[PDB]
Design a protein around this ligand. Structure first.
Ligand SMILES: CCCCCCCCCCO[C@@H]1O[C@H](CO)[C@@H](O[C@H]2O[C@H](CO)[C@@H](O)[C@H](O)[C@H]2O)[C@H](O)[C@H]1O
Ligand SMILES: CCCCCCCCCCO[C@@H]1O[C@H](CO)[C@@H](O[C@H]2O[C@H](CO)[C@@H](O)[C@H](O)[C@H]2O)[C@H](O)[C@H]1O
Ligand SMILES: CCCCCCCCCCO[C@@H]1O[C@H](CO)[C@@H](O[C@H]2O[C@H](CO)[C@@H](O)[C@H](O)[C@H]2O)[C@H](O)[C@H]1O
Ligand SMILES: CCCCCCCCCCO[C@@H]1O[C@H](CO)[C@@H](O[C@H]2O[C@H](CO)[C@@H](O)[C@H](O)[C@H]2O)[C@H](O)[C@H]1O
Ligand SMILES: CCCCCCCCOCCOCCOCCOCCO
Ligand SMILES: CCCCCCCCOCCOCCOCCOCCO
Ligand SMILES: CCCCCCCCOCCOCCOCCOCCO
Ligand SMILES: CCCCCCCCOCCOCCOCCOCCO
Ligand SMILES: CCCCCCCCOCCOCCOCCOCCO
Ligand SMILES: CCCCCCCCOCCOCCOCCOCCO
Ligand SMILES: OC[C@H]1O[C@@H](O)[C@H](O)[C@@H](O)[C@@H]1O
Length: 420
């Protein structure tokens, strides 16, 4: 401890008192994430600049069994503040049809202070049933995926990205109940009910506890299989979500006519719904070391054609830990994602342009045809200490916002992760 290579905290164990608190059931954490991005070539605006965005996360993890005598119970408090600007908005995107993904995943949801987690959790029958209640985002339990890449498409719950209008990951919180049945040490099922309340997105409501503005509920379900394949760990997720809030059609007006022709309100549907798959698998163990080798990953996502802008999404990638004996804790990442836009969204746009008489893409009143956006990242993670990782990355974006008229973007990124 103190500032050392093997402490998982930069400030160490505070002369022992941190390790005591840990024994007594208290785990206090202060985690930092900084992301830099600068355009090197292409995208909507080719004036070269750089943007920086970051996040602090202050946490309190309580073992309520030691502290209160409550048999496997846990409390968690997390507060975040985020700061900075996003390259995706400021250079890459068409201003009237912004990028779906983002070259700085850590940016978004208001750049302020938020209550990001506040929940109590208890297990029953030797950890067979797991009940969790309080405030958190869907991605924390459902459709969960790590966040080492800088590009949004390869970080966190993807359902949270493409139906992010109602499903809100970290750092947004909402009242929620999540019930989990562990059928087998390597297989579980789970369902949840999340307050769905767009006012949580408004700056000012970073610490909202009231249920005012609730539009309905999101109800995710999931099966998560974590088998060993050839002695190597994998994790496979299959899920479905259902949302009880009203959503607008992407094309039909209230009468079933194309709304681009009428200007009347969109037809309203009483719900949204979709499915997802997450798969991650370690496929090699470098020279017999389980802690090194090649891991593959994939994500697929599918959404209701009626209301969702993103039709479907796919992502494939890999990461190698410890390619070289010299740097056994370093990693190499590569990922490709495809984000397809609901064709009716495009059809509606073609109609708009037809009716405004504006057919030139360079005309501000023209409404870009959104088709398919691709993202790719290649990164290298230096394991500086156990409390510091630094990963430069290279990002490539084909048709930002799905707009073929926007040149491919080459972006340079630097992602930093540290725990104090
Ligand atoms: C590791 C972290 C290193 C920090 C990288 C990001 O730095 C940003 O770079 C911009 C510059 O590239 C600055 O913006 C300023 O500088 C430019 C000047 O031309 C303008 O594009 C901007 O509008 C203007 O706000 C901005 O202050 C600065 O935070
Ligand atoms: C929806 C969620 C459902 C919540 C229901 C709460 C029930 O709690 C369980 O009750 C068992 C019975 O009391 C306990 O088993 C324990 O209790 C017995 C002794 O009292 C032993 O036979 C068991 O081995 C021992 O694990 C067990 O720990 C406890 O979690
Ligand atoms: C990992 C690395 C992957 C590399 C893949 C690069 C593909 O980029 C596309 O290539 C086309 C070019 O072949 C472009 O089409 C456009 O570009 C040309 C420009 O002259 C036209 O001839 C085409 O018709 C037109 O569709 C298109 O926009 C561009 O996004
Ligand atoms: C990083 C990973 C790189 C991934 C590389 C993918 C290259 C394929 O590019 C395609 O080109 C089509 C056309 O060439 C486009 O379709 C549409 O685009 C044209 C207009 O730009 C229309 O003429 C077509 O009818 C229409 O199918 C479409 O957006 C795009 O998928
Ligand atoms: C889902 C939260 C459940 C927490 C209640 C724990 C029970 C506290 O009293 C235990 C008495 O022993
Ligand atoms: C609040 C955001 C203002 C920018 C200051 C960033 C300073 O934090 C750097 C932390 O790096 C840890 C290593
Ligand atoms: C296609 C989704 C798979 C359905 C599994 C969810 C089952 C709900 O679990 C309830 C736990 O109690
Ligand atoms: C992920 C980072 O990879 C970036 C790869 O850049 C690809 C550029 O090559 C395709 C564009 O060039 C076409 C004509 O030169
Ligand atoms: C041998 C020392 O370690 C080699 C450095 O690894 C390559 C760094 O590449 C990162 C891209 O900037
Ligand atoms: C900060 C923007 C710069 C772009 C980052 C580039 C990341 C892509 O590089 C990944 C591949 O680099 C391979 C490193 O070679 C390994 C050297 O280690 C050998 C040990 O002796
Ligand atoms: O709320 C979900 C997601 O929204 C994005 O704006 C943030 O940059 C992500 O860090 C976050 O995971």
């Amino acid at each position: 401890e103190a500032f050392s290579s093997e402490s998982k905290w930069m400030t160490g164990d505070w002369g022992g008192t941190r390790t005591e608190l840990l024994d007594k059931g208290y785990d206090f954490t202060l985690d930092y994430v900084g992301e830099v991005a600068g355009n090197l070539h292409g995208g909507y605006n080719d004036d070269k600049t750089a943007r920086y965005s970051d996040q602090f996360a202050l946490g309190a993890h309580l073992d309520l069994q030691k502290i209160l005598g409550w048999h496997d119970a846990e409390f968690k408090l997390a507060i975040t503040e985020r700061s900075g600007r996003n390259l995706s908005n400021d250079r890459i995107s068409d201003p009237r049809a912004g990028q779906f993904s983002s070259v700085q995943e850590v940016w978004g949801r208001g750049q302020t202070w938020r209550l990001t987690q506040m929940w109590i959790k208890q297990k029953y029958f030797d950890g067979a049933l797991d009940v969790k209640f309080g405030r958190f985002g869907e991605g924390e339990d459902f459709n969960s995926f790590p966040c080492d890449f800088q590009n949004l498409a390869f970080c966190g719950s993807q359902v949270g990205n493409w139906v992010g209008g109602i499903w809100y990951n970290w750092p947004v919180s909402q009242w929620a109940l999540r019930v989990k049945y562990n059928i087998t040490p390597a297989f579980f099922v789970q369902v949840g009910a999340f307050e769905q309340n767009p006012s949580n997105l408004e700056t000012g409501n970073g610490f909202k506890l009231s249920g005012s503005g609730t539009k309905g509920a999101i109800m995710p379900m999931e099966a998560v299989w974590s088998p060993k394949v050839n002695g190597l760990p994998g994790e496979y997720r299959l899920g479905y979500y259902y949302s009880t809030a009203k959503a607008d059609d992407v094309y039909d007006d209230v009468n079933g006519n194309p709304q681009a022709l009428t200007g009347e309100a969109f037809k309203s549907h009483s719900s949204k719904h979709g499915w997802w798959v997450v798969a991650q698998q370690q496929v090699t163990a470098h020279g017999g070391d389980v802690n090194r080798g090649l891991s593959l990953f994939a994500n697929f996502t599918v959404h209701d054609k009626a209301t969702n802008v993103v039709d479907n999404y796919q992502q494939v990638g890999l990461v190698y830990k410890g390619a070289f004996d010299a740097r056994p804790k370093d990693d190499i990442g590569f990922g490709v994602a495809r984000i397809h836009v609901n064709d009716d969204v495009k059809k509606r746009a073609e109609l708009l342009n037809a009716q405004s008489g504006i057919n030139d893409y360079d005309n501000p009143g023209f409404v870009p045809l959104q088709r398919t956006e691709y993202n790719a990242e290649l990164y290298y993670g230096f394991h500086v200490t156990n409390w510091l990782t630094v990963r430069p990355n290279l990002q490539y974006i084909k048709s930002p916002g799905g707009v073929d008229e926007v040149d491919n973007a080459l972006v340079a990124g630097l992602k930093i992760q540290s725990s104090f």
